[PDB]
Amino acid sequence: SMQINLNSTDPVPSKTPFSVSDADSYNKKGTVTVYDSQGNAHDMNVYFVK
Amino acid sequence: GATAATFSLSFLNSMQQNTGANNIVATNQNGYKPGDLVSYQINNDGTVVGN
Amino acid sequence: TKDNEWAVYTHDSSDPAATAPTTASTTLKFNENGILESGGTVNITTGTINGATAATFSLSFLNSMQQNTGANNIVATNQNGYKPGDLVSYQINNDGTVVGN
Amino acid sequence: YSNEQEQVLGQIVLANFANNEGLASQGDNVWAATQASGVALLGTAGSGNF
C-alpha cells in the first residue's frame, strides 16, 4: 500500500506527450520498493499526472 | 534469474486538501528479504518473541 | 557461468601430484525461487599419498538457498570421516551410558 | 652458556598410572607401584594422557 498527499489545484503540465526522460512531464515522482523470491530488490517508479 | 515482482498495490486513504505540495506519507510492502535471527526476547505478557 | 547456474570445481591439495581441475565437477541449477533441484550429492574420489588407498565420498548441497543473501555464505557443513584420536578421559552421563572422550 | 648456545639436559618424564587409588603410600608423599595399579605408561607433558 502507498499513500501520498497531492495538491487539488496543481497545474497540469503543458507537455501533452508523456515520457520518463523528461523532467516537467509529470507532477510528482515516486518509488515502490519490492523484493522478489530471490532476495533482489526492484525499484518500481510511480509518476502522477492530471 | 529471479521471479518477476508480482504484487498488488493499493492507494486507499488518499487525501487531496491544499496541504502544500506533493509528498508521500506511507510506503510499505510484504516482500520481506530473507533475514537471520539476531536475539530472542520475552515480554511481560509471557509471549516469547524472536527478532 | 550463467544465470541460475553454478559450476563446482574440486581440487585435492593433499596430493602434490594431483591434476588441477579443468572441467566442472558438478552443476548447481537453482530454481527461480532460489531452490536447488539439480546437484544433490556428488561423489569425488581423491588420489593417493605414500601408496595409501584412494578415498571416495559424497558431498551434499541439500538445504541451500541462493537468494542474494549478501555474498557467498556457508551456514552448516559436516562429514562422517573423523580422524583417529587417543582416549583423553571418561565420564558418566545422567542417562547411565559410559562415554569415552 | 657464555656463547649464545642452547643445550638440553633432558626433560622430566611423567608416569601416569592407568588405575589410580590402588597405589600404596610409602615414605614421604611418594607412592609405590604394585599389583592392581598398572604400569607407569611413561610419556611427555605435551598432550594425551598427560
Side-chain angles (χ1 to χ4, degrees):
Chain A
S1 176
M2 196 278 291
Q3 303 180 9
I4 177 179
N5 298 266
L6 299 177
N7 184 20
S8 301
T9 175
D10 200 322
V12 47
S14 59
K15 202 67 174 182
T16 27
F18 183 82
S19 55
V20 284
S21 180
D22 195 3
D24 292 357
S25 180
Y26 60 90
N27 293 118
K28 173 65 175 185
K29 192 169 188 298
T31 180
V32 171
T33 159
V34 296
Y35 287 81
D36 48 26
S37 187
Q38 209 180 357
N40 290 259
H42 286 68
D43 42 7
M44 183 65 52
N45 311 126
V46 177
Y47 317 101
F48 304 91
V49 299
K50 178 180 178 179
Chain B
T3 62
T6 61
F7 56 90
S8 174
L9 193 59
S10 177
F11 299 81
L12 197 140
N13 197 340
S14 302
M15 294 301 180
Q16 185 184 26
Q17 306 67 15
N18 227 22
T19 167
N22 305 333
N23 40 19
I24 304 178
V25 73
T27 301
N28 76 319
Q29 82 290 345
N30 81 312
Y32 306 146
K33 57 185 177 303
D36 50 327
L37 168 66
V38 180
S39 63
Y40 48 87
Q41 184 192 9
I42 171 64
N43 60 3
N44 57 274
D45 207 3
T47 72
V48 49
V49 185
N51 304 335
Chain C
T1 59
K2 55 173 61 62
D3 203 336
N4 292 343
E5 297 278 9
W6 282 81
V8 188
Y9 298 89
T10 169
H11 177 42
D12 183 272
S13 183
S14 299
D15 302 306
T19 168
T22 303
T23 65
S25 57
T26 184
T27 169
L28 296 185
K29 174 55 186 181
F30 299 88
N31 201 339
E32 209 174 350
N33 297 328
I35 309 302
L36 65 104
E37 63 276 28
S38 177
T41 56
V42 190
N43 287 321
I44 301 298
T45 301
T46 177
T48 294
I49 319 99
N50 296 95
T53 307
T56 170
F57 64 93
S58 176
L59 191 145
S60 180
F61 297 87
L62 187 139
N63 285 335
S64 298
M65 287 65 57
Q66 170 185 187
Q67 290 182 359
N68 203 334
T69 59
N72 314 323
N73 196 319
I74 306 295
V75 181
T77 301
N78 81 91
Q79 76 294 339
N80 300 333
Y82 48 87
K83 68 166 68 58
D86 40 313
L87 183 61
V88 177
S89 61
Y90 51 89
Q91 45 81 21
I92 306 306
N93 45 27
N94 293 79
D95 51 67
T97 59
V98 287
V99 182
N101 299 331
Chain D
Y1 292 88
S2 306
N3 44 25
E4 294 287 347
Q5 289 297 332
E6 192 274 345
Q7 286 194 350
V8 283
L9 304 91
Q11 61 183 182
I12 44 186
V13 299
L14 305 187
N16 180 19
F17 286 91
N19 330 117
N20 296 342
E21 303 177 355
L23 307 180
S25 174
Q26 287 285 354
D28 54 323
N29 60 86
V30 308
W31 292 275
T34 169
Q35 193 179 358
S37 62
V39 301
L41 191 59
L42 302 85
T44 180
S47 293
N49 297 335
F50 315 95

